[PDB]
Amino acid sequence: HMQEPLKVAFVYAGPVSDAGYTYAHDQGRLAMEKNLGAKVKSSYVENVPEGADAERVIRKLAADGNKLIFTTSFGFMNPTERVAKAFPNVVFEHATGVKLAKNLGVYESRQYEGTYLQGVLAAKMTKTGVIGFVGSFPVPEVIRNINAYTLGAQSVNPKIKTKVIWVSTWYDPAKERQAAETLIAQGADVLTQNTNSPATLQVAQEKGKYAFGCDADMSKFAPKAHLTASISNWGDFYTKTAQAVMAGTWKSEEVHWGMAEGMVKMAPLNAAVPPDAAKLFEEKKAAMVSGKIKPFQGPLKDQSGAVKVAAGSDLPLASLKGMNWYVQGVEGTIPK
Ligand SMILES: Nc1nc2[nH]cnc2c(=O)[nH]1
Numbered sequence: 001h002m003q004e005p006l007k008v009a010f011v012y013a014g015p016v017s018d019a020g021y022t023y024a025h026d027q028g029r030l031a032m033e034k035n036l037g038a039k040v041k042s043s044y045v046e047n048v049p050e051g052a053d054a055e056r057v058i059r060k061l062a063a064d065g066n067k068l069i070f071t072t073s074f075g076f077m078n079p080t081e082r083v084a085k086a087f088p089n090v091v092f093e094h095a096t097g098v099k100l101a102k103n104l105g106v107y108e109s110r111q112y113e114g115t116y117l118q119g120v121l122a123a124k125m126t127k128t129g130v131i132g133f134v135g136s137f138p139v140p141e142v143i144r145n146i147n148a149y150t151l152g153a154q155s156v157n158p159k160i161k162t163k164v165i166w167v168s169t170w171y172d173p174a175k176e177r178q179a180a181e182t183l184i185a186q187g188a189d190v191l192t193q194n195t196n197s198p199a200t201l202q203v204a205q206e207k208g209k210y211a212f213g214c215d216a217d218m219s220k221f222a223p224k225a226h227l228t229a230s231i232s233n234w235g236d237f238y239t240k241t242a243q244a245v246m247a248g249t250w251k252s253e254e255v256h257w258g259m260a261e262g263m264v265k266m267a268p269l270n271a272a273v274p275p276d277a278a279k280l281f282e283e284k285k286a287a288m289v290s291g292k293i294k295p296f297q298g299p300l301k302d303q304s305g306a307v308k309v310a311a312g313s314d315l316p317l318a319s320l321k322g323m324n325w326y327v328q329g330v331e332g333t334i335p336k
């Protein structure tokens with residue numbers, strides 16, 4: 001019945017005060033601490049850059065006696081794989097990665113389920129017929145979200161166009177704000193983002209447009225603009241993983257949880273959403289949870305007109321994992 005506390009560390013690419021992505025991972029850590037109490041001792045490091053700095057931070061946490069380390073950014077993938085080889089008695093969990101080892105697992109959300117529902121609402125609320133996406137880097141997570149936003153919108157209005165702008169960072173509130181201003185200048189009036197700040201929401205509110213929270217309810221930053229949010233609940237996953245390491249049941253695997261598992265939840269609808277739109281949103285949400293609809297159910301074509309998925313089929317897990325193609329109706333912004 002007696003066992004020393006499990007030392008668990010979290011490595012963040014951003015600040016806990018982003019009120020988005022890192023905030024939600026850190027709420028997951030705090031949920032793990034509440035659920036497991038004295039059986040776990042957690043620590044975290046914020047604002048860890050990619051490459052040599054990340055490797056040095058992850059090594060130091062492994063050297064300090066942490067037995068379970070979560071690296072919560074795509075950009076920590078190669079540093080995590082190198083430190084895992086050097087620390088074969090430490091369990092490593094890497095968010096959104098594709099590299100596994102005996103002591104390295106990977107985990108991610110199916111947030112694109114929520115992004116699909118956002119696109120349904122964006123189609124109902126847009127006046128220009130142009131929706132906007134602030135992207136970080138063209139990795140499969142982000143391209144799945146761009147496509148899911150577009151397909152969700154197209155389920156309501158097949159003529160919808162999605163304009164994408166890239167900021168080449170996950171988190172920079174000044175760059176995110178400039179990117180949101182550019183999308184609105186180029187005719188987008190309902191915005192979503194894969195970056196980590198509420199900057200896009202604040203710009204939407206200032207310009208009288210709409211946007212969506214990402215990873216947390218961001219309505220306090222922009223009560224008029226915030227239609228809803230795709231909330232990320234990491235707490236149950238972090239709890240289960242820490243429990244597995246303590247109990248000796250942990251094994252390397254690829255974990256993907258969505259709305260059915262409670263990792264992805266939608267915030268309440270803005271009062272501006274009319275009853276016809278709200279009703280459709282609740283019906284599609286129920287269908288998403290039950291698996292009666294899937295964001296990448298066929299038929300799908302890419303932007304060259306190639307068939308990716310036939311009607312009555314679903315996109316295979318391999319194509320989801322490596323997604324680097326766009327559906328018809330996705331375009332870039334004019335640069336400068
Ligand atoms: N959404 C998202 N935000 C991040 N911020 C830093 N790394 C990531 C990542 O992998 N995904």
Ligand code: EMC
Pocket residue numbers: 111115145192193194195213214215230
């Ligand atoms: C739109 C993906 Hg946070």
